[PDB]
Structures are given as C-alpha cells and as structure tokens.
C-alpha cells in the first residue's frame, strides 16, 4: 500500500510504503515516517487524529468495519453525515473522514490529509 501524507504543515507531500492490515493503524505508519498527526489520547475517544482519506484507485476500495467507537467519535466531531453513516452501515464502505489511530491500512493507494489541528476544528 502507498500512502501519501499531505498537510499545510508539511512542506511537501510524503509518499510512504506500508504493510496492509498491521495492528499499527496508520498512526504507527505516520510516527515511523515522521508525519506529525496530532494524537492526544490512548483510548480512542478524542477527535485529534482526524484525517481525510481519499481512495486514489477508486476501483480498488476495500470493505471495512466502522466500529461504533469511531462512528460515535466522528459524529461527536461532526464529520459523519447521515448519508455516509448509512453507506458505512449498509454497504461496508469507509467514510471520507477517518480517525488516524483507528484506521487499519488496506492494500490500496491512499491520500491522507490533515490540518495539524484537533478533529473538532
């Protein structure tokens, strides 16, 4: 899997080769490759590691489970519209906004964008 980290803080977008399905959840990848996503908790109930993930392949998007913890955190932050929640619940497709500490890397090309700010704003 190829992950392109983009952010206003980063001078340039960073291309990273990652192993899919590791217990490290794309935070581990960011911390290994020096990408600074704000992670400020250890249980998963804050929104800081909020990122926007774009599937660059389009026809290679993998099915995933949107855990109730991540869904509740995204709804508390306000980045989970009703349509995307329904799509995740019914068709198993990931939403556009994810939490970088609960997002398991899949075997595709992804574009991860963050603002260096907590999830809420």
């Amino acid at each position: 899997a190829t992950i392109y980290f983009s952010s206003p803080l980063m001078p340039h977008n960073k291309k990273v080769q990652a192993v899919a399905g590791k217990r490290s959840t794309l935070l581990g990848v960011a911390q290994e490759n020096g990408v600074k996503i704000p992670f400020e908790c250890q249980d998963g109930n804050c929104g800081s590691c909020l990122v926007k993930i774009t599937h660059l392949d389009g026809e290679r998007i993998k099915g995933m489970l949107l855990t109730d913890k991540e869904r509740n955190v995204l709804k508390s932050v306000g980045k989970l519209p009703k349509s995307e929640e329904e799509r995740a619940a019914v068709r198993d497709l990931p939403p556009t906004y994810r939490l970088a500490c609960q997002t398991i890397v899949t075997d595709e090309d992804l574009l991860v964008e963050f603002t260096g700010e907590p999830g809420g704003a």
Binding site: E40, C41, S48, D68, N72, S76, G78, P118, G120, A121
Partner: protein, 289 residues
C-alpha cells in the same frame, strides 16, 4: 413555531445569570423554554434548577460507556416554570477540541426528540471568550436561528462581540443565522449604556435592552434562585420581563456588518473608557525627556 436562539458573549460579565433570568421571565409568560448550556463549566443552569453542578452529557456518556446508551431522563432535568435544562459539558483540556460537548449534546437532543415536543424557545448558552470552530457549531450549522450577544463597557466584551459578528457573516450564506441584538450588563460605567447603542447601529442591529446592576440579583444567586423567582415585585424583575417581551416580538434579524479594530478603538476613545494618546514620549526615558 420553535425559535432556536443562542446567547453568545464574553465570560465573567454575568452572562449566565442574565440568561437564566431571561429564560425564567419567558417561562412566567407560559412559554415552553429549554436551556442548552455549552460552557465547559456547568454554571449555566444553577439558578433555575436550584442545583449545584448539574451533571453534564459528557460525564454521563463517559460513565455510561457511550452516548448510544444514555437516556434522556438522566440528561434532561426540569426546573422552575417547566424550563427543561441540559448542560453539554466539555472534554478534559489536553484531549482534542474543547467544542465536542456542544456538538454531542445537540446530536443527542435531536436524536432523542427533545426539540420536537412543544418547545417555543431553545436557548443555547455558548461561551464566547474565544471564537473557534468548536463553539461555532450553533453558528456554523443552522441550529442557532437567532443570536443575542451579551456585552459590556469593557473593551474585551466588544472585541468578543465583533469576533462573533465576523463569525456570523461567514456562515450567513449557508443558513438563516442572524444577529437578534446586543444585550448589556451594567458594570457601573457612566457611558456604558450609550456605548453599546453606538455599536448596535454600527453593526446594523439594536441594543435589545440595557440591564442595570442590582444587589438583588447577587443576593438571589447565593440562594441558587433566579431574581424573578426570588422577588417578583422587584424592579429588576420588571426590567427582565421587559427584556423577555422584547425578545419575543423581535423581528429585526440582520446580518451583522462587522466593524474593524480601529473603528472599535475610536468609539472607546470617544466615550472616555480609554484616553486618547498622541505624539507622547515614546521610546524615551521619562526623566530624559
């Protein structure tokens, strides 16, 4: 016919007490009202519920696992006159955005159906000390139809009012969010009453009411009771009823054309809050020059 209103303003100027007295005055008219506090401190509903530190939605959700398990009865408590009160709460400082509490509370209330029953007014008490996207959810979204800014003669209060006005115009295109009018709290400044009206017209709005400072409000606070439930015959109660009546029949909903920093400086210089300085000794020692 529900009129979802919000009351922004700088903290520390007695905004919570004024809001609770206003809501109690509404309830005296038979209007069904609901207070949704948004401060990290649950001080917004301690004079109507007659309680101390009402339990927040964040604390209940944390102790009950998640928000999906919480019950409306625990969160929503009834007070004097039937004004149901809800405190959103807030996260711990170091973790995430501090504005998740209001967003969680609004979602919980709209999912449980608290808004749809019979409410005429739903006042949001938001802390406007810092204007950021966390607490701007009532403005960024279309939840807060009408905004009422609580300001004082102090420069920081205006500054916060101007920041809130700038925030309002940003999202005015998306939804129907307008500034109802500025409210005032008398800090016993001589020019305080005439200073705010000089701002309302410049912002295109109206000062809905100038609230005078009285010792009866403070003596009612130590009783954990609103001044209109404490001494209904007091003139403070009359002025708060006038404020509530004005809030009711307020059809002036305009986009708050924001002033600039220098324009705010000039009016404060004019009204004697701060004195005008010009070509004084700058960058020089007092005894040298």
């Amino acid at each position: 016919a529900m009129r979802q209103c919000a009351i922004y303003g700088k903290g520390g100027i007695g905004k919570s007490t004024t809001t609770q007295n206003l809501v109690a005055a509404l309830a005296e008219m038979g209007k069904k009202v609901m207070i949704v506090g948004c401060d990290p401190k649950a001080d917004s509903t301690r004079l109507i519920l007659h309680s101390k530190a009402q339990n927040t939605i964040m604390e209940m959700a944390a102790e009950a696992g998640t928000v999906e398990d919480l019950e409306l009865e625990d969160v929503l408590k009834a007070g004097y006159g039937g004004v149901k009160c809800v405190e959103s709460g807030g996260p711990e400082p170091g973790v995430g955005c501090a504005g998740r509490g209001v967003i969680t509370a609004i979602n919980f209330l709209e999912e449980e159906g608290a808004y749809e029953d019979d409410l005429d007014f739903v006042f949001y008490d938001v802390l406007g000390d810092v204007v950021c996207g966390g607490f701007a959810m009532p403005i960024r979204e279309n939840k807060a139809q009408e905004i009422y800014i609580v300001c004082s003669g102090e420069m920081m209060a205006m500054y916060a009012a101007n920041n809130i006005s700038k925030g309002i115009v940003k999202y005015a295109n998306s939804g129907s969010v307008r500034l109802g009018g500025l409210i005032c709290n008398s800090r016993n400044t001589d020019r305080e009453d005439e200073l705010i009206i000089a701002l309302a017209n410049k912002l295109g709005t109206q000062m809905i009411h100038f609230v005078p400072r009285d010792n009866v409000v403070q003596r009612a606070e130590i009783r954990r009771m609103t001044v209109i439930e404490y001494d209904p015959k007091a003139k403070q109660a009359d002025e708060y009823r006038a404020l509530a009546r004005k809030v009711v029949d307020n059809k002036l909903l305009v986009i708050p054309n924001p002033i600039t920093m220098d324009e705010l400086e000039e009016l404060l210089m004019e009204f004697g809050i701060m004195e005008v300085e010009d070509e004084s000794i700058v960058g020089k020692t007092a005894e040298e020059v």
